[PDB]
Amino acid sequence: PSALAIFTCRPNSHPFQERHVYLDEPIKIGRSVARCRPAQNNATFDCKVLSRNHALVWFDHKTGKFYLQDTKSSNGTFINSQRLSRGSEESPPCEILSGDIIQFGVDVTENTRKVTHGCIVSTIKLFLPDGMEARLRS
């Protein structure tokens, strides 16, 4: 048994393939870098607007709650469009529920050229170690 977060790519997201992220321990969310590349079982994204150490997601095995924390991201982390912390500041742990829309970064139109870079926008579905779906967003 292992708690599980499934990340699926929303229509307004920079593209990524669906992730099946097991949460036996906290998982870093961050930008793809050497030695830390995207994989199905992780929350590492090839996306310009993410920080290397962007956020952290985990399951609290003693209460059955799931959490997301912004770890001083430059461009923001959001739960249902609400920003967890200011730029370059840490948030407290923020509880996430199954069905939340989670966003890392924001779209950025460069100031020096006409290019727009997308951000990661995901639905997250959350499952307890025994397989039952976690508390649902309402």
Residue numbers in the entry: 2 to 139
Reported in the publication:
A proteomic study has shown that MST1/2 interact with a specific PP2A complex called STRIPAK through the N-terminal forkhead associated (FHA) domain of the adaptor protein SLMAP. FHA domains are specific phospho-threonine (pT) binding modules. Like other FHA domains, SLMAP FHA adopts a typical β sandwich fold that consists of two large β sheets. One sheet contains six antiparallel strands: β2, β1, β11, β10, β7, and β8, while the other sheet contains five mixed parallel/antiparallel strands: β4, β3, β5, β6, and β9. The major structural differences between SLMAP FHA and other FHAs with known structures reside in the loops connecting the β strands, especially the long loop between β10 and β11, which forms a short β1’/β2’ hairpin and protrudes away from the FHA core. Despite the differences of the loops at the pT binding site among various FHA domains, the pT-binding residues, R32, S52 and H55, can be structurally overlaid with the corresponding residues from other FHAs, suggesting that the mode of pT recognition is highly conserved among FHA domains.
